[PDB]
Symmetry: D4
Subunit: 200 residues, 8 copies
Amino acid sequence: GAMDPQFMKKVAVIDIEGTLTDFEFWREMARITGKREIEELLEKGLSGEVEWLDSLLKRVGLIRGIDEGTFLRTREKVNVSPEARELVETLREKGFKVVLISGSFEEVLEPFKELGDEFMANRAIFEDGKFQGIRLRFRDKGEFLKRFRDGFILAMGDGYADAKMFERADMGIAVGREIPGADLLVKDLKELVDFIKNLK
Amino acid sequence: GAMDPQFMKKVAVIDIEGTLTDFEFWREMARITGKREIEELLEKGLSGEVEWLDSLLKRVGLIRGIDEGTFLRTREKVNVSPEARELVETLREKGFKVVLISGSFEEVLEPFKELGDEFMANRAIFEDGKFQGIRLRFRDKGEFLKRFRDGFILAMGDGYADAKMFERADMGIAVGREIPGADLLVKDLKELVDFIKNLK
Amino acid sequence: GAMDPQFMKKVAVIDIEGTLTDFEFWREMARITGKREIEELLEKGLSGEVEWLDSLLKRVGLIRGIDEGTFLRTREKVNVSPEARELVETLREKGFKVVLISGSFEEVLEPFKELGDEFMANRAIFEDGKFQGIRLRFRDKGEFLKRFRDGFILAMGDGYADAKMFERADMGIAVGREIPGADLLVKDLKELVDFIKNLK
Amino acid sequence: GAMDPQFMKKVAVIDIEGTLTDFEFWREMARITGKREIEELLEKGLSGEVEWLDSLLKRVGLIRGIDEGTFLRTREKVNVSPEARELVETLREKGFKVVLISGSFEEVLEPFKELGDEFMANRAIFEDGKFQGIRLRFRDKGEFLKRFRDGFILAMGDGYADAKMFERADMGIAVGREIPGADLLVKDLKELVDFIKNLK
Amino acid sequence: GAMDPQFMKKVAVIDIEGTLTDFEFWREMARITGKREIEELLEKGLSGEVEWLDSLLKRVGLIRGIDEGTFLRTREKVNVSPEARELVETLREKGFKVVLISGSFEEVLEPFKELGDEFMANRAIFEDGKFQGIRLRFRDKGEFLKRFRDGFILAMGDGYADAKMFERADMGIAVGREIPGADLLVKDLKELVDFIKNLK
Amino acid sequence: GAMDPQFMKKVAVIDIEGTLTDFEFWREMARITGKREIEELLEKGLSGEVEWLDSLLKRVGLIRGIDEGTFLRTREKVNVSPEARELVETLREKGFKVVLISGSFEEVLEPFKELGDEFMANRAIFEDGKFQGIRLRFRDKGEFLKRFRDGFILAMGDGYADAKMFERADMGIAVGREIPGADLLVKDLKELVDFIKNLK
Amino acid sequence: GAMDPQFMKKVAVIDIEGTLTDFEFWREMARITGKREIEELLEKGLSGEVEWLDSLLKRVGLIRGIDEGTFLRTREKVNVSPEARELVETLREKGFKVVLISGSFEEVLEPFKELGDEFMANRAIFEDGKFQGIRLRFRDKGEFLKRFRDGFILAMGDGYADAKMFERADMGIAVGREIPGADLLVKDLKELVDFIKNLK
Amino acid sequence: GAMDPQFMKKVAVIDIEGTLTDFEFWREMARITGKREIEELLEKGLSGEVEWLDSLLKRVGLIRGIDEGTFLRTREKVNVSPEARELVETLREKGFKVVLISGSFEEVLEPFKELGDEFMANRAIFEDGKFQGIRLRFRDKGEFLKRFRDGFILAMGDGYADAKMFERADMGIAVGREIPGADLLVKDLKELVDFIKNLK
């Protein structure tokens, strides 16, 4: 093994939210701050009632001023299940290069940061120990996927993904709930790993 | 293994001539027909003295009228060495999709036809048991490589390949004699297989 | 005829199933194995009730364990009718380059392998004499057609083709039943041959 | 022949000057007018000593004021030889669509106007029965060839053609004297027709 | 006027049928042959009830065998009205390069062949003095317009034009009756000429 | 004249420096400050001895701190000669859309700002009445010309222009001294105006 | 600040009408001239009942002959509010390059001409002191935005903007009333400035 | 600061080696292992005597078997100087998005991993506690830069960069020694920081 030509490998992109974990940062924030307008805005954003970015920025503005420590504290509710680790490792076995993405913060989703071969999520701005706003590191997941316009993509996602993300993938798989653009539907992380281990 | 997603695999393209076999069809024809103008034209074509296609068509016109049986007879001088088979099988192990190409005829290079996952060479036209001309199935090897413009390509070739073929590859490897565009140089099929087994 | 410039020729792409043969591998398998869920999944898949790939992989999973010999035997129900041969030979007369495609297996559809100038279908995986799964050699037929994006395409297909395959062709012809995107509709292979002989 | 799908055919483009005719309009004007600066400028333009357009516009300005009729008489020196007609008709038989182009005037090259399937050359401006200037209908022959960028191109040309025109062709043939970009070299129109008749 | 840089000029494309003439070739043939299926098919093709090409080829097959002379006689019902000539000449005045196109035959629309700076229509096949079929010189008018993909286009058309032709134009003008894609609606050729004479 | 369709017009691009004015801002500043390193750097930048941007920024740093008033006073040495105005107005007459560009400052080249239909140059930074640096509004003139990638371009330039600017133009004209890429050479503004007045 | 690399900055494009000013030139002309058909046509054009260009040219034709001075007085109703100036200056502070665009006339919108870094609107034709017609300087706002296809775009617009303009933007913001394609909706210029100030 | 639109920011790409650190991993390894063939291969590779990848893989093969711990220990000679930190933080001030790249290992260059906004380098393969080979995560730095083809790029690099990396950047800055393609040359990191603080 004088070489692993990683750059020539096909890419497995996993949207972390709702595929590797049930944790939903904005619902947790809605609980913590008692502001149900946050979770209402989430619901509106997922249901396509309002434009995604609008809901996101409104929510971001809502939790503004929150303590840094309280914020990072939510990391403890995020966990790399052994099923998730199995999925990633299996994908590597089955010849893929694993890329994990999320709309949420890297600071919250830190356990996954070194799990896959590449990791991208948005970030948080902290002035004087208090939350100020969000660093939007990518426009959306579809646009982000343009980084691999030069290769092939197997995409796995849940209710935080959408058609645009899958219209970039060569093979698209939705988890739990159906998504326009996805080729297959599995019911849960289990079914998904069972599928992935049925490869090559 | 409910699925081998072959279409998402990176592609290993091998130019058969001078990498998997020492057989040179046109030199054999030059010997058989005693026309040294054929081999002279070959030499001129490789050395870039004359434009490749011109030399090729002149040679094609030179062996015109040759017997069908005599023609196909040269197949017996073509052999799938165990080193070659090892190379292909190893490439498949090391995650590639193997594509074999040649400027010569499929009818002569028939043993390799089912070796790799894809096979392309030019063909022969036979009217009344006599050789009439050539079916040019592709313009050149670089242009042919546009079939995989959507993925990555490791290219291995010898003196019948050129810069244009390698300018398409992400990683290019020349065998025996140096080629502009190639990233590496191995000395022989042995060294090449040794390299390939040092992968992933 | 010192040269046939096959690569400059316009391309006639034929979806084998339902144009060159009445044979439907999955229905046949439904008969052999008595698993009617196979033919039900096929029916659902064609009607777009379920996503094509999902139903397909389900069907593959249903026939898992079938004997290799029994599987390859299904080839015996596949035959190159003289009408098909006439169609292909006519297309060659009318200046086309014939490319045969199918979503089904090369192992079953082998008689057609040498009929056209190029042949592509998916393949079968056989571990320990028993059938394990499917090698998907192309993403779909439309995507496959990108191999000839540098020229023109006349596409002929039946119910295993769809809009995506035809939105690539410059001229599209549907066989038997109408397909969104197709320019013309013929009723069967005969009428299609009558059409093709009417060219130039 | 209920249909000729002409638009799907590969394109044979012939640069008229030095391939179908010995006629060189500018040398003729140089003789007619006794201005040898015209033929000198032509020589300079062909040899690439000075920019083509500079020489062309200089020559146009040189013959300015010339009589319309006197101008058009040069047509009488133009003849569609039976060899040329044979070339075109053979190309048609060998499946091509014929496009004739020239840098010179349509008014002079009128006999060729209906020979091929498409015809393009520059034109002449005539106000009050006298030659005023030139209507430049295409930038150059390479740029012109972009009209068929959606298909394949066999290009045949002589010393009024150049690299840019042939860098567009899939197959390039030079007539009489070799040109960078051309794939083949023939010695004359006869040899070229002999070549074309060795096709399919 | 040492130069008219025609190739740099913006292009004014006129769909001849129903803009420069009230003549409708297919209705005329329908009258001549008393076959109302021809005119019914015309109506169906325009209304998009059946695919355009299907209806067209049906009509071509319907009129098959008609006498050559009878066919060409229809030219006599086509006339370059002075209003049309005014339109074209004005367009040249207003800085345009005029290109005339139609789906009908050049043999019929001959008066228009030298009217504009470029002319394209489909053509007719005549074997042994009898009409055999049609040479389709372009796929459609929209596709045809790609010959000018490198510049700007003002497109004018009537009920034989459609949306695809106009989605290529930078400015689209409908005549008589509204068409999806067009920017403007004029009532007749007069109104259009008045519009064009109001330019620059 | 209900409309001037300016956006459909072909574009005439004039590099102001050395075409519309003999004024050279950097030489003037070099005289003013007695720093000959400025003019030496100008010479070096034009001759390609050192990279253009390097020399430019060196000059900018050289002149740093200069008084705002002293800087803008140089406007008084710039004049819209009546020949220049004639050129532009003629270009509009001859169907062009005139765009003026320069590497120098808008603040200096102000008379030209409303001359053509579009105007672009770089600008100056002034903090507390003293010159601080340069706002580079375009990367280079060639890159700038991409704003008109959708149409045609006649480009005219002098010794402050270069090849990259002209490889974008469909027709390029050099003034005074020859530049790689240009099609023509004129000797002065007069000759150029005479050329332009010889159009259409 | 020896350098401002302005060309590398992301672009903030503001559609002036309904974002920076309440001024609606066509309503103003409708009032001035008592032709209510003007404001009716405006309403129809905005609501997409009739094609934008049709309505625009109809309106232009409606106010034809109007006095130049009377026309320009409408400028006096135009004011660069301090909120607007604040918006632009903030955008500059938040790292953007500001481009102001409008469908209306530069002559009316002169106060805004030097506000942003780049300014584009359509223009007016005035022969003999009287309004004749309109110079259309861009096809539409979407097409205009192609000038910055090489970078990123934040677009802010109101009811004179549309989907095409926002489908070009990476981030779209509608002002006052929601527009398909826009990502966010603010209620007024104030809210928008408050948003912009929450950046970086 | 409710939002930082990082994705719309222009990108500053820094090749770490020879810009942010004097550390040269292969030379260090040459010291530790006393194998001077390593440093000889490096020298040959930089000078382009041998193809980069060939020399690289040779070097990898030389250091095969080295202890994992000893390898990772080399990190101790890598340190984020305060000048580097100043550069990155300044780039962020000056509106850039900082992307750190290297051909070397993440394991050695770990201190820089969290310095910029994005970090990419190649990795190490460790089987049974001993070093086996290299994971090539990108083809080369130029190819890597295609991740930001949708925006602008300021590239800073040293002797581990080359022309291909700079022919992608809109503005290129070389450090220490001149590189073909670079626009500017600085002598060391200090002068570069002095340059960067001079922006906007």
